[PDB]
């Protein structure tokens, strides 16, 4: 329940998540508060992954395991839902590769006001609105909303011909995630 502090003045801000010893339905939650007074327009989130291990589970595909997870990301001023149960594979391909087909899957749900041309997602809001929605910046830039992230192992509940839970193919699997957060100037370049 302890929030994480991302100092936007820092060179790189990233948060890692270890997905290990989980079972379908499990959720992981983390809060982030930004700190700054640089002229920041956006804070762009992207996802990377790695270190997949089968650990005796029948699945040996890193991507298939990744595809079992969803992320909900919101900001708190009411709560503003930016990403709602976005599939982690789709989010990886969009935000790491700017893959167009993957972006289309996310664009099904997301308000394009949060989507950066690069494929990364803007998570910097002030009372639920992005900074460029405002008519200029005050002499002292307002602190950005708190960010809340929820990662869940989706629970299919599908059985096969043998009556076994199909998602047990992932039993034992582990993988590591890293979410990056990049502050941008008002011209859109990294600070």
Curated annotation (Swiss-Prot):
Tell me if Secreted is a UniProt keyword of this record. Answer: yes
Q: Which UniProt keywords apply?
A: Secreted, Signal, Sporulation
Q: Which residues cross the membrane?
A: none
- One GO CC term on file: extracellular region
Q: What triggers its expression?
A: Part of the tapA-sipW-tasA operon. Expression is directly repressed by the DNA-binding protein master regulator of biofilm formation SinR and activated by the extracellular matrix regulatory protein RemA. Also positively regulated by the sporulation transcription factors sigma H and Spo0A and repressed by the transition phase regulatory protein AbrB, probably indirectly.
Carries keyword Chloroplast? no
Which GO terms of the molecular function aspect are on file? identical protein binding
Disruption-associated phenotype: Mutation impairs colony surface architecture. Mutant forms pellicles with less extracellular material. Deletion of the gene results in the production of asymmetric spores that accumulate misassembled material in one pole and have a greatly expanded undercoat and an altered outer coat structure.
Q: Give the GO terms filed under biological process for this record.
A: sporulation resulting in formation of a cellular spore
Q: Where in the cell is it found?
A: Secreted; Forespore intermembrane space
How it assembles, according to the record, is: Forms fibers. Fibers have variable length and are 10-15 nm width. Interacts with obg (AC P20964) in pull-down experiments.
Q: Which family does it belong to?
A: Belongs to the peptidase M73 family.
Q: What does this protein do?
A: TasA is the major protein component of the biofilm extracellular matrix. It forms amyloid fibers that bind cells together in the biofilm. Exhibits an antibacterial activity against a variety of Gram-positive and Gram-negative bacteria. In laboratory strains, is also involved in proper spore coat assembly.
How is this protein named in the record?
A: Major biofilm matrix component
Organism for this UniProt entry: Bacillus subtilis (strain 168)
Name the encoding gene, please.
Answer: tasA
Parent-record interval covered: 39 to 238 of 261
């Amino acid at each position: 329940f302890a929030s994480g502090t991302l100092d936007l003045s820092a060179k790189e801000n990233s948060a890692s998540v270890n997905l290990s010893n989980l079972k379908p339905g499990d959720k992981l939650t983390k809060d982030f508060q930004f700190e700054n007074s640089l002229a920041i327009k956006e804070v762009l989130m992207a996802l990377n992954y790695g270190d997949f291990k089968a650990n005796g589970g029948s699945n040996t595909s890193p991507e298939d395991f990744l595809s079992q997870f969803e992320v909900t990301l919101l900001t708190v001023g009411p709560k503003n839902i930016i990403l709602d149960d976005a599939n982690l594979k789709d989010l990886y391909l969009m935000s790491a590769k700017n893959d167009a087909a993957a972006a289309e899957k996310i664009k099904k749900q997301i308000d394009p006001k949060f989507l950066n041309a690069s494929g990364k997602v803007n998570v910097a809001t002030i009372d639920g609105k992005t900074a460029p929605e405002y008519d200029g910046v005050p002499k002292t830039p307002t602190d950005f909303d708190q960010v809340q992230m929820e990662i869940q192992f989706k629970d299919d509940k599908t059985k096969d011909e043998k009556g076994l839970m199909v998602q047990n193919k992932y039993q034992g699997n582990s993988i590591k995630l890293q979410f990056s957060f990049e502050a941008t100037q008002w011209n859109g370049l990294t600070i």
